[PDB]
Design an enzyme around this catalytic site. Structure first.
Site, short mmCIF file in Angstrom:
data_model
loop_
_atom_site.label_atom_id
_atom_site.label_comp_id
_atom_site.label_asym_id
_atom_site.label_seq_id
_atom_site.Cartn_x
_atom_site.Cartn_y
_atom_site.Cartn_z
N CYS A 1 -0.69 -1.88 2.73
CA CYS A 1 -1.38 -2.02 1.42
C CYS A 1 -2.13 -0.72 1.10
O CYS A 1 -1.46 0.22 0.62
CB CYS A 1 -2.27 -3.26 1.42
SG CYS A 1 -2.69 -3.84 -0.24
N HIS B 1 1.43 -7.67 3.40
CA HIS B 1 0.69 -7.80 4.68
C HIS B 1 1.60 -8.42 5.73
O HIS B 1 1.61 -9.63 5.91
CB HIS B 1 -0.59 -8.64 4.47
CG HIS B 1 -1.68 -7.89 3.79
ND1 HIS B 1 -2.64 -7.18 4.50
CD2 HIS B 1 -1.98 -7.72 2.49
CE1 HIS B 1 -3.48 -6.62 3.66
NE2 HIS B 1 -3.10 -6.93 2.42
N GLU C 1 1.45 -8.53 8.90
CA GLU C 1 0.66 -9.13 10.01
C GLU C 1 0.55 -10.65 9.83
O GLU C 1 0.38 -11.34 10.86
CB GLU C 1 -0.71 -8.46 10.11
CG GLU C 1 -1.65 -8.75 8.95
CD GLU C 1 -1.64 -7.72 7.83
OE1 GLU C 1 -0.56 -7.15 7.56
OE2 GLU C 1 -2.70 -7.50 7.23
#
Ligand SMILES: Nc1ccn([C@@H]2O[C@H](COP(=O)(O)OP(=O)(O)OP(=O)(O)O)[C@@H](O)[C@H]2O)c(=O)n1
Ligand SMILES: Nc1ccn([C@@H]2O[C@H](COP(=O)(O)OP(=O)(O)OP(=O)(O)O)[C@@H](O)[C@H]2O)c(=O)n1
Ligand SMILES: Nc1ccn([C@@H]2O[C@H](COP(=O)(O)OP(=O)(O)OP(=O)(O)O)[C@@H](O)[C@H]2O)c(=O)n1
Lengths: 534, 534, 534
Positions: free
Chosen positions: C379, C506, C508
């Protein structure tokens, strides 16, 4: 035959009638053919009520086994047939005394003795002792839930409920649901807060008994049912009543005994309360009224004469007579004279210890004897009757008890060891509980009891002096009852009198509303017959 | 100087009269020349009472600034002259709305928003806003101490007491000390348990206000003083009273205001309660009696008309007339007819919304007008008076409000935006709080108010339709009051009648027992004159 | 069939790992073929974590549906395959917002809105909404039992247990059993006092999860079992562990899942934890080691990057590489220079908002690109990579985001509405949750993901400016991924580099220890290959 336990606790205030509620419920269960008993756990430190003053805590009740107990055991025996004993009443003081003694004996084997588990264990042991061999055991926990004094009792009965299980234990919690004029409603908020205190110490109530000065409506009971997570039928309204004899019927009408029999899986027939209905009917429909004077030294607390007051009421029921009990201070007879004994249909002198007010009671006995007013003397009431007759008929100037005047010339009342004649010559400790008394042929009491022998309960030290008795007998007095090898005087009668009886034993302790009592029935009858002559 | 705070809490039950107690104390302090105010913290989630139904909550009270508030602010304004505003009442709902608005906006700068400190901070900020600029601020906490709904309020005021200090804060706790027939005494145990709940959340009470159905004797007050660790003079008996006007005198006679002035180091002269003594004297010494019928749709809870009932009582004081207020359901007039309006010396139709019972009120207005029975219509009461006259005199068949029958031919009552004539032609929202009204010369109200302009408070949406007004005026109805640029009808009168007045505003909100109210004084006088004519 | 609820509470302290415990238990039940879900009830007033700062609360986790939630839902998705939504997390703020919206609207029909029943009803409704359609629902209550902030949640779940019954509800309470050097034993007294607080609010725990820095021995578990009145097998030891992946095995070895399946009458096969045993084996048997620098602006709380740290660990498992994560403050790069980026095998720049530390991240991106150190930008990490390349290769002086320098000549990052070229010419908000991304042929990510399209989750406002993109592309930067009709840049790659990838989404949030993640697996592999080349 698994023993069931109903733990009876109280919230918001002390004076909910936990004992009367327990006794009333026990009466319903007994009327279904169940073997029931009740016991009282008192958070007071007094080893037993033996020491507790009548003025402070009311009458000392005496069981058959000679235990000195709380007046609540009087309520219990007036509601069920099961006889109370030492096992049916114990204090925190008794429990701590028990544990301190076990420590001396070395029972704890050098262990650290603790509130949990050692104090809680001692409590559980005494509850099991008093309970086992019964279908249902009602255990009244003294105090108000949230107070520190009853926490060990509440922890003990919590443990018992876990061990025994919800199949054979119930928590019945009395609560105050008070009326507020401002809102025109009874308030459940105190019940909400009391139940939270109960939950905090690990007790969930099964039954809520809602005390108020009026009926607790279905809406409020439904509110209590939901916040307590119990069925609506487990929330009971118990308004203030003019007669405790109505409470068994009021609880039955809300099906409380049905709920208990269901929870404990007890298959028994419907409660036959016909005898209680008869008592209520009798009380509601008196034919005539009498005023009976109770002349004593403890009138400042009426509960000092709890069993005597109930016995006089039971005398009323059996004669269909309304009894107006006028509590008179014997010391007022000493100061203001015999004018305060005017307008009485009968006179009762109850039990007592110490000299304060006794001379007023002797004057009272004389007044009743001379004016042919029906007389009943109990224990001290018999002493003053004997002293009166000794002084004023047998011409034994200043005749007295060694309790009051130790060095009196005519100790007509004294301890067996103190027995002496007027010349100081001699022959050659508290009597407690049930003892057989032999009734003399052609005596009034022989007629009333309709038996050669009776069993009544004692609580006294000082006896009739047999060395000075025959001189009083020759002066006209009659021995109506005796007991034991020493042939101790139990009952005396003044024969030239419509109704004059005095006994050493406490007949008030064997009187019940359903069975009445021969002496009290006879006494109230004599009072009505006197009233009709006036 | 420094602002002092009295935090007023309640224990055991909700309905202790916390508002009346606070208002009565405030009255004493005002009578000592102090600048005093009161505020109500309500634990309800409603942003304000504007939504809450009258039969659930009681009347919605309206302050001068047009805030919709708890009826307690009516108690406050009837006891002290300090004017209430939006600042004197807020709910948990308002606090959460405040904090959520601040949060979603971004005032907390990405912080975790918590009950402590963010909710408690919001509470303290609103208490300070309402309080600062006064000598003494009484802060009433709604609910019963121990309940979860008031825990944030109690934590907030606890923090304030620490910050401000014991020199300028007091905790005044109301408690129930209930009487038990069993003990023949009032019971302090509920106070003991309530104070324990206060201590657990970090509040020590300074003053105990003991509520009961009788005087709490010195011996019981002494017990409470010891277990609360407060002086005996900080324990006050507040028994149930027939008149709330007596409470200031009762509290002053026990020196409550003396204790408060001492704690806050306020040097001020003794309270002169002569104004309250006069109100009590007037109330106790009526010359004649009347029966006034209040015909409405919320009578199932009398508190729905709290201020109207008090305004009628104040009307009685000024005339020395005892007012018997008969609450009549307007729906019973629809079913059973005008039979149920018999034996009334006057008729009052109060405010309301929705069509249920409105036809019964129109019939009631007609009955009063035709039979020359004194009539006062408030808001809806004015609507049904206008409708009655439109239908039955001006011959406007089925004339109605657009609230009730939106498509009616003659909308004599309607929203300004809905205003139409009978042909559907037109011209080329909730009014809240104080507004000036211009009274018309030769009107009854111009004489009663004795001024050309008045200030009264509104709570209404639907107005008199000015397009159909001239036709009703031609039929004999008189406009007695107007307001604003739109010249909205505020007061109407039927002249050919002893006393017929109806107003849009709520005059009950400016009536006090000391000052009375010109309209209610005139109404009750007319009721007395009607009663004598019969 | 019937939905079962496990209410997960915590006592003594907040930081017991309630989320990890719930997630670990859920993992066992899923491995027995059960349909399981978890939800988090947060007592904070924040409507959601969207406002809450990462350094206060930890990372904002994003579900597929685009809900901004507690990082606990990251724990949930990393332990079970049931996908989380908005329904699996709500705050007190959300509940009050719900009730206030319903109230001001008019759903409560003029009723008084109360904590009980209206707030508790709103809580139960959201628990049911999240739970129904699953075999077992684990409901984590945030806070410590006894605190005021969670009392409404605890009352809500208490009511649910009564309604649903003990056949389909369990109370699992985490407690601290701390070790004292003084006694040489773990202490149950805090558990005793915590359970007492639960009982006071009407909750009896079924399961005790005993947290300590060591095993809670059988003797201490036996004590807890007795004082809680639960079986010994319902008292579980959960000691501190080096790996959360071991907790499922630890709980299963004590038969926790067996007890739960028995209580809920679930007939399901034994849990096969081979997938967790494999994760533990991989973790315990690394082949090589790397040091990866995470350069960001929230390193003062590591939980700000919770999912990124776990995603790097998962990248290690798949490569048998031990990852040493060195948290580096990007502001230290601004002050001390690229000195502090020495001895790193790879560099990760995670997400963030605001300009503080961003220039340090641009310098970090430049350092990694010029020195051929493996780089992953997430990001903000992609923004600083684009800015670095724009400035230092495409010769766009002071190229920036409009977030940081709104009036910059080259806004290479900007809102779609702000898109302008260097001459100010133009074309003719927060993206949240899962969106399809189209990967470009011959890109590194097209190979790693091994699919033409992927689904990843967004939490960003500012996009790549397509007006200035072609010039950066001409300078050698490659677009590797796009999304939507506007063809927004999702992934960029620097080709003349061993491993340089940066994405808008994202990744993750979709990484798990069992499944890993293609991007993090590739990144850690590149880090290992770089380490060996040195
Ligand atoms: N543990 C509890 C239980 C109830 N309440 C609150 O109690 C209020 C109602 O109290 P009250 O008006 O006194 O009525 P009841 O509880 O019905 O009590 P009572 O029967 O005495 O009128 C509700 O708003 C509810 O939120 C509370 O705060 N905490
Ligand atoms: N925190 C407390 C306070 C008092 N007590 C006990 O409360 C008893 C007295 O209670 P009660 O007979 O109800 O009388 P009061 O406390 O005077 O209450 P009330 O005014 O309601 O009669 C005492 O034996 C004392 O040990 C207690 O156990 N815990
Ligand atoms: N009587 C109280 C006191 C505090 N809180 C709540 O406690 C929370 C903070 O608890 P925690 O995160 O455990 O932190 P601390 O209270 O600081 O505790 P510790 O020192 O153990 O971290 C706040 O949200 C506050 O609303 C509460 O609900 N009731």
């Amino acid at each position: 035959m698994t023993t069931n336990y109903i733990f009876v606790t109280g919230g918001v205030v002390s004076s909910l009638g936990k004992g009367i509620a327990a006794a009333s419920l026990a009466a319903i269960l007994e009327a279904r053919g169940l073997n029931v008993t009740i016991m009282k756990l008192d958070p007071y430190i007094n080893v037993d009520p033996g020491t507790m003053s009548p003025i402070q805590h009311g009458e000392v009740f005496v069981t058959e086994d000679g235990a000195e107990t709380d007046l609540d055991l009087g309520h219990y025996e007036r509601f069920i047939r099961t006889k109370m004993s030492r096992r049916n009443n114990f204090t925190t003081g008794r429990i701590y005394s028990d544990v301190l003694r076990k420590e001396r004996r070395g029972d704890y084997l050098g262990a650290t003795v603790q509130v949990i588990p050692h104090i809680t264990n001692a409590i559980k042991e005494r509850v099991l002792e008093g309970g086992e061999g019964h279908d249902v055991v009602l255990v009244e926990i003294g105090g108000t839930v949230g107070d520190i004094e009853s926490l060990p009792f509440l922890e003990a009965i919590r443990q018992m409920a876990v061990e025994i299980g919800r199949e054979h234990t119930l928590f019945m919690h009395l609560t105050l649901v008070p009326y507020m004029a401002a809102s025109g409603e009874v308030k459940t908020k105190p019940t909400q807060h009391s139940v939270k205190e109960l939950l905090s110490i690990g007790i969930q109530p099964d039954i809520l008994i809602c005390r108020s000065d009026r009926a607790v409506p279905a809406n409020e009971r439904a509110k209590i049912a939901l916040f307590c997570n119990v069925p609506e039928k487990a929330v009971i309204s118990l308004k203030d009543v003019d007669s405790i004899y109505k409470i068994p019927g009021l609880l039955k009408s809300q099906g409380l005994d049905d709920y208990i029999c269901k929870r404990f899986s007890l298959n028994c027939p419907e409660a036959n309360l016909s005898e209680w209905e008869q008592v209520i009917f009798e009380e509601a429909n008196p034919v005539s009224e009498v005023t009976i004077g109770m002349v004593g030294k403890y009138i400042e607390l009426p509960d000092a004469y709890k069993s005597v007051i109930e016995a006089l009421k039971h005398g009323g029921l059996k004669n269909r007579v309304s009894v107006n009990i006028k509590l008179i201070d014997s010391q007022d007879v000493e100061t203001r004279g015999v004018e305060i004994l005017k307008g009485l249909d009968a006179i009762l002198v109850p039990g007592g210890f110490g000299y304060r007010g006794v001379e007023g009671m002797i004057t009272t006995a004389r007044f009743a004897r001379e004016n042919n007013i029906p007389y009943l003397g109990i224990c001290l009431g018999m002493q003053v009757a004997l002293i009166d007759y000794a002084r004023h008929v047998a011409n034994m100037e200043n005749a007295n008890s060694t309790e009051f005047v130790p060095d009196c010339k005519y100790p007509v009342v004294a301890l067996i060891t103190e027995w002496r004649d007027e010349n100081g010559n001699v022959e050659v400790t508290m009597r407690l509980g049930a003892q057989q008394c032999q009734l003399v042929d052609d005596s009034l009491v022989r007629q009333l009891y309709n038996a050669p022998t009776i069993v009544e309960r004692h609580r006294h030290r000082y006896e009739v002096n047999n060395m000075l008795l025959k001189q009083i007998e020759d002066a006209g007095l009659r021995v109506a009852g005796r007991s034991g090898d020493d042939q101790l005087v139990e009952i005396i009668e003044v024969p030239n009198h419509p109704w004059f009886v005095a006994c050493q034993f406490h007949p008030e302790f064997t009187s019940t509303p359903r069975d009445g009592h021969p002496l009290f029935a006879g006494f109230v009858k004599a009072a009505s017959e006197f009233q009709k002559r006036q």
